[PDB]
């Protein structure tokens, strides 16, 4: 529903990257974090392609003595991950509505079983 | 509460790596993933030190067509790559120590930018 235009933006932005190469192992990702969770929720729903899959929204730990929500985006190759980092950054500049998420590229040693 | 014995195992195991070393930035972590949430929950509650902080349990995606176990995971954020591997060992010790605990797969994590954890 609400995350739909954002989805199409990434759809043509990522281009070839969205399609999945069965050989590549899921070893990199992009973590987005902000204070407004529903924004991340729409980001999570938007980044759903064969080649780029976002996990659900969750938190980072903070010592109690404001919650920080985050969403992890998993991508087949390091090249793609940077692209996702740009993709959102473009949307943020493109659409003034969208809040400004901080982010960081993620590097896994051992691959993950996203598929097969 | 139920993850008290597990917490104390790590408390002594990690030793000084549990401390802050405040100069350090958080750019490393360890992702644990398996098919049993509540084991990961207990892990998450156990890993809670000044130098090692675990996020809550979450999932990894799967595609609609794929038959899947609905695997869950927890991130364990750290000071340095030094602590991150130690974390990986710490859990493996507990897994070999206590046969009860299901054997989680895991992976050391590396971040580009530091995360806001202080
Ligand atoms: Mg803006």
Residue numbers in the entry:
A (entry chain E): 1029 to 1093, 1097 to 1147
B (entry chain F): 1029 to 1146
Lines quoted from the article behind this entry:
Among the very few genes expressed during latency, the latency associated nuclear antigen 1 (kLANA) is the dominant protein expressed in all KSHV latently infected cells. LANA is required for the replication and maintenance of the viral episomes and thus is essential for latency. kLANA directs the replication and tethers the viral episome to mitotic chromosomes to ensure efficient segregation of the newly replicated molecules during mitosis. kLANA consists of 1162 amino acid residues divided into at least four unique regions, comprising a proline-rich region, a central acidic repeat region, a putative leucine zipper, and a dimerization and viral DNA binding domain (DBD). The distal C-terminus DBD is self-sufficient for both dimerization and DNA-binding. The DBD binds to specific sequences present within the terminal repeat (TR) of the viral episomal DNA, termed as LANA binding site (LBS).
